């Protein structure tokens with residue numbers, strides 16, 4: 001997160017770290033005691049999932065192994081459409097003041113809606129500086145029409161843009177897969193942006209989660 005702030009204690013109990021061994025690979029967001037949502041590009045054979053702490057590589061946090069990933073079959077490595085994935089935990093996480101599932105969206109929030117995105121990505125770019133503390137950036141939803149002015153044909157139908165005009169506040173390396181929450185629901189998952197990060201008027205791009213409610217439910221479904 002470029003030009004963010006340290007997220008308030010307990011305000012993001014759905015944030016997880018997806019670790020490659022001990023090292024940060026991606027963000028992710030708890031959606032059930034057994035299930036984490038994140039970006040398809042974040043996929044690995046196995047993860048260590050850190051839950052219930054604002055501090056990356058927290059020795060006290062619960063780490064739960066995960067080895068089963070369910071990428072949206074429509075994910076493109078070329079265009080990065082459908083950049084969404086569910087990851088099943090080996091064991092269920094215990095809920096607490098630090099651990100809690102996010103509310104999945106019923107509807108798509110409109111442009112201009114106030115949001116917050118979080119992660120342990122670098123706070124500087126191109127030179128990198130990885131924080132201990134979970135960082136937060138307040139951004140607003142940008143219409144497709146407006147975003148297309150910047151990214152043209154790179155933008156697909158289920159990518160969602162967000163940022164603040166003439167601000168650097170934004171996502172960056174290592175924030176991939178993390179939550180964009182607006183109005184108490186998850187509206188986006190960090191997918192991409194321009195490099196170097198934090199260029200004013202280069203929105204962040206997120207997978208638009210309200211467009212995947214059916215796939216998300218079908219994949220987690222636990223009943224007839």
Ligand SMILES: CN(C)/N=C1/CN(CC(=O)Nc2cccc(-c3cnn(C)c3)c2)C(=O)[C@H](Cc2c(Cl)cccc2Cl)CN1
Nearest residue numbers: 024025041080171172173174175176191192193194195197
């Ligand atoms: C789908 N998309 C095209 N691929 C990526 C690449 N990506 C993965 C990544 O960089 N992971 C990662 C995870 C942890 C550490 C580092 C890293 C970077 N530099 N070093 C030394 C380590 C990198 C990312 O994390 C990118 C982060 C990003 C964002 Cl989210 C917005 C604007 C610019 C950037 Cl560069 C997003 N997109």
